[PDB]
Scaffold this active site. Sequence first.
Site, short mmCIF file in Angstrom:
data_model
loop_
_atom_site.label_atom_id
_atom_site.label_comp_id
_atom_site.label_asym_id
_atom_site.label_seq_id
_atom_site.Cartn_x
_atom_site.Cartn_y
_atom_site.Cartn_z
N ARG A 1 0.74 -1.23 -0.13
CA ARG A 1 0.00 0.11 -0.20
C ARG A 1 0.70 1.23 0.06
O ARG A 1 1.82 1.37 0.25
CB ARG A 1 -0.93 0.08 1.41
CG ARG A 1 -2.05 -0.84 1.01
CD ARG A 1 -2.61 -0.75 2.62
NE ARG A 1 -1.94 -1.16 3.54
CZ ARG A 1 -1.36 -0.45 4.67
NH1 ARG A 1 -1.39 0.90 4.54
NH2 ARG A 1 -0.36 -1.16 5.41
N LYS B 1 -8.00 -3.25 1.53
CA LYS B 1 -7.95 -2.14 2.79
C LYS B 1 -8.79 -1.10 2.59
O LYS B 1 -9.00 -0.32 3.59
CB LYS B 1 -6.47 -2.08 3.07
CG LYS B 1 -5.52 -3.34 3.37
CD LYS B 1 -6.09 -3.89 4.67
CE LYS B 1 -4.93 -5.05 5.13
NZ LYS B 1 -5.27 -5.49 6.33
N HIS C 1 -9.05 -5.56 12.83
CA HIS C 1 -7.89 -6.17 12.03
C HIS C 1 -7.40 -7.39 12.79
O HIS C 1 -6.43 -7.42 13.49
CB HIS C 1 -6.76 -4.94 11.83
CG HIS C 1 -5.75 -5.56 10.80
ND1 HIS C 1 -4.43 -5.25 11.06
CD2 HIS C 1 -5.75 -6.29 9.73
CE1 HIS C 1 -3.58 -5.73 10.27
NE2 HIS C 1 -4.50 -6.51 9.38
N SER D 1 0.84 -6.16 10.51
CA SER D 1 1.15 -7.01 9.43
C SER D 1 2.51 -7.63 9.81
O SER D 1 3.22 -7.33 10.38
CB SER D 1 1.62 -5.92 8.17
OG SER D 1 1.89 -6.90 7.08
N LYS E 1 -1.40 -13.33 12.16
CA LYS E 1 -2.94 -13.74 12.03
C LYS E 1 -3.15 -14.61 11.16
O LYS E 1 -3.98 -15.54 11.43
CB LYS E 1 -3.37 -12.39 11.69
CG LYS E 1 -3.35 -11.11 12.48
CD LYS E 1 -4.24 -9.98 12.22
CE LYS E 1 -3.64 -9.17 10.92
NZ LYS E 1 -2.43 -8.87 11.03
N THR E 2 -2.71 -14.70 9.85
CA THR E 2 -2.98 -15.60 8.72
C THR E 2 -2.28 -17.02 9.26
O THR E 2 -3.11 -18.01 8.92
CB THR E 2 -2.73 -15.16 7.48
OG1 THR E 2 -3.60 -14.03 7.10
CG2 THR E 2 -3.11 -16.13 6.30
N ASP F 1 -8.28 -11.84 8.42
CA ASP F 1 -7.87 -10.47 8.32
C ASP F 1 -8.90 -9.29 8.83
O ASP F 1 -8.24 -8.28 9.40
CB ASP F 1 -7.26 -10.03 6.97
CG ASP F 1 -6.40 -8.92 7.07
OD1 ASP F 1 -5.32 -8.75 7.38
OD2 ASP F 1 -6.83 -7.77 6.18
N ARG G 1 2.95 -12.50 -2.07
CA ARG G 1 1.69 -12.87 -1.57
C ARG G 1 0.97 -13.83 -2.36
O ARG G 1 1.07 -14.14 -3.62
CB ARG G 1 0.59 -11.38 -1.26
CG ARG G 1 1.18 -10.47 -0.29
CD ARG G 1 0.64 -10.94 0.93
NE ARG G 1 0.81 -9.86 2.04
CZ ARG G 1 0.27 -9.55 3.46
NH1 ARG G 1 -0.69 -10.33 3.66
NH2 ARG G 1 1.05 -8.57 4.16
#
EC number: 4.1.1.49
Length: 535
Positions: free
Chosen positions: A60, A206, A225, A243, A247-248, A262, A326
């Site tokens: 981003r 996002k 988040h 980030s 989490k994933t 997410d 990714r």
Amino acid sequence: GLTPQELEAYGISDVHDIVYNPSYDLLYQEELDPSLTGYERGVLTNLGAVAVDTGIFTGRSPKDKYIVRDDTTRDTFWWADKGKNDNKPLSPETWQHLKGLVTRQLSGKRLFVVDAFCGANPDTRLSVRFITEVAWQAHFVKNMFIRPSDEELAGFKPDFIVMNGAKCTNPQWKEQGLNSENFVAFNLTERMQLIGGTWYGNEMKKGMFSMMNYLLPLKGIASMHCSANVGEKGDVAVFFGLSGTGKTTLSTDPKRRLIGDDEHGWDDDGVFNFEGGCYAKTIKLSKEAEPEIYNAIRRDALLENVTVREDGTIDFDDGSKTENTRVSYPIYHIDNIVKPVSKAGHATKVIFLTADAFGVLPPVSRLTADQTQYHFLSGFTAKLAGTERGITEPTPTFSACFGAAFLSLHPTQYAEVLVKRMQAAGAQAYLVNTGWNGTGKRISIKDTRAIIDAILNGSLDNAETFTLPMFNLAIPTELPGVDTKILDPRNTYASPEQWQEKAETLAKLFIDNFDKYTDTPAGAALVAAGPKLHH
Ligand SMILES: Nc1ncnc2c1ncn2[C@@H]1O[C@H](COP(=O)(O)OP(=O)(O)OP(=O)(O)O)[C@@H](O)[C@H]1O
Ligand SMILES: [Mg+2]
Ligand SMILES: [Mn+2]
């Protein structure tokens, strides 16, 4: 789904070819068209998934994010010019110029139009219409948003429009006071997002998350988040974190049914996913350590910025294009998911993940109620920024609510609604350091998974604890499946004195960061829950 005349209503003229609701099969052949040039091109990997390069942007661009300041947003948005955030004000007049750039760019092109939902629940979801001229961008949004049924498509009425003009740039940016020729702009009066200059798909994902973060807490719904999953007994866990914190990785757990990886809300009925897919990091991906994520990389997944060798194999270790390689995939590429709707009951376990490059924080600690609010508002993680120059320059990030880049309201508004939901459910919170200790290496995924298991099954709640100085964190004395030595971060240094020096550095960083919240009675009261340093 729509006619060239409907597109003209958005400002887009002379569209001769409209691809509405492209199928996965069409997107595959579009991406592999051998006549494509530049960053539109996909390549087929031996795993069956298409890989693309997202261009100059591989993440981003928060410095290019703008929100129109008008009578709808002026007194409700968390503005960058009024704590640090990226919600920079934009005029309605300047917005009209950016809209002209994008709509002219998309005029006279073959367009993909993807209709999708953001939010699993009909009462709060956004109906979003995405317009792009790049097939893999349409594929990204097909993977990441909720794909409507045929009945839902038949009566689809957009309440947000996202126009991706990646191929255009803004020649007037200097006179308009903007950061660069690129832009990611939002207008809540027109309910639209415009993108120019950057091709990166996550600006759309996002971007819509930011809009949910605006609308939901104003209706009493937490917007988070976090990843989320549920066990056999119906016990729900949420995992917050910045980030790269896990989490994933850690929610994709063979012992649990995945809700989402997410973006989630928490309403009167429970926790619900905003998305229809997952967006995994692939740098150094190990099939042995992350088998479910690895297995999801197959036809209809979309790889971003990976290195593909001449023979079609993927070098997952190669971060030459970016460390932020990714893969996106629809959520059903994971075997054990909640379906047909990604939602479950109220969370009773709330896990804050952090990657502490200072090597101070323990692998796991159980948080008091006040520590929960303190650490939620602090939103800490850190990185070893100097690795490419052979140094450990641990660099802190304090990002409120573990996701300040996506917040549209003030951090305390997210904290208030989260606390309300947690208190009603009797939820307990835990701080997990998935980062570094005194070894200068990250804790292994295997050990972190064992820590998560112990949180989720109640083991950790049933343990005795000792208290870590300075931060006053309750740590378990032992845990099944994890070496007891690492539970105390001081044990991974040659002496408690080495840890103490780093702990004092980190405590000062937290204390300085939190000062901005101490302008209210409740915030000043939370200082007592933070690290203590008086010398
Ligand atoms: N102990 C650990 N726990 C979790 N992840 C780890 C650990 N050690 C290394 N990793 C790596 O850290 C990264 C975790 O990234 P992950 O995709 O889970 O982050 P995230 O929190 O989902 O970030 P984002 O919100 O940007 O998607 C992966 O590259 C993973 O392989
Ligand atoms: Mg993730
Ligand atoms: Mn994220």
